[PDB]
Amino acid sequence: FTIRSNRTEGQALLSDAAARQERYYSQNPGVGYTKDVAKLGMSSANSPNNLYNLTIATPTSTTYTLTATPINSQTRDKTCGKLTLNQLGERGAAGKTGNNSTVNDCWR
Numbered sequence: 001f002t003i004r005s006n007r008t009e010g011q012a013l014l015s016d017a018a019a020r021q022e023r024y025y026s027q028n029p030g031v032g033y034t035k036d037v038a039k040l041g042m043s044s045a046n047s048p049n050n051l052y053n054l055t056i057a058t059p060t061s062t063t064y065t066l067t068a069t070p071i072n073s074q075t076r077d078k079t080c081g082k083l084t085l086n087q088l089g090e091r092g093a094a095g096k097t098g099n100n101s102t103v104n105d106c107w108r
Contacts, residue, residue, distance in 0.1 A: 003077045010052040010068040011107055014085040017042070017054055017066050021087070032061030033087070046071070052083070063087050080106035 020040035021033050035056040037045045045054045052068040059065065068083040070076075083106065084092035091097070093106030 001073075003074065003079075006049075006051050006074055007077070007080060007083070007106060007108075009047045009049060010070070010074070010083045013047045013052050013054050013068045014066050014083055017056070018064075018085055018087070018089075021064055021066075033058045033064045083107075 017037070017040060020042070024034055024039055025032065033056075034040065035058055037054060037056070042054075046052070047054075047068070050072050051070065051074040053071050055067045055069065057065045057067070063086070065084060065086045070081065079094065081094045082092075084090075084097065091103055091107050093103045096102050
C-alpha cells in the first residue's frame, strides 16, 4: 500500500468512469454527458478502498473532465495529487496535462 501503488486505483476510477460516460451518452441520446455518478451506474464517488474521490465537470454537453482527488491516507501524495482524464483521453496529474514526465509517471 505505497502511495505509488495506490495510484492504480485512482487511475482506474477515472478510466472506468470515462467508459461509463461514453455508455451513458449513447444510452441517452440528446441528453449529453452527466455529472452524477449514479447515472454512470456507480453506488459511490469514492474508489473501492476510499483512496480517491471522483468529481465530474461537463464544460459543454459533449465534453467532460474527470478528477480523482486523493482522500484519507492518499492525501500524502503531493507528487501526483489530483489525477484527471477527459473525453479525448487526455491524462493529467499535479495540475498538469499531456505527454510529459510528470503526468506519465503518475499514470504508471
